[PDB]
Amino acid sequence: TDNTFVSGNCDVVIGIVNNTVYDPLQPELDS
Amino acid sequence: TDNTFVSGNCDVVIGIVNNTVYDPLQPELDS
Structure with a gap:
């Protein structure tokens, strides 16, 4: 993004x- | 931003x- x-x-x-767009916000929320 | x-x-x-500035981290952190 x-x-x-x-x-x-x-x-x-x-x-x-x-x-598939690799949004960097996704793994930060899951961390 | x-x-x-x-x-x-x-x-x-x-x-x-x-x-007012739309902060993309605001709804993501709430979600």
């Missing part, structure tokens, strides 16, 4: 793909 | 206004 940024949804961009 | 950065104070800036 620090290298990328969010804008809109995935129903507009042509050629868009799916992946 | 991902779109702004802190510096100085609200006394030196001419024409500054008041607002």
Whole structure:
């Protein structure tokens, strides 16, 4: 999430793909 | 905080206004 940024949804961009964003806040909450 | 950065104070800036900053750690820590 620090290298990328969010804008809109995935129903507009042509050629868009799916992946998993490694949010660094997630393992900090679980620690 | 991902779109702004802190510096100085609200006394030196001419024409500054008041607002509220969405802290991404606030809802994540509460959740």
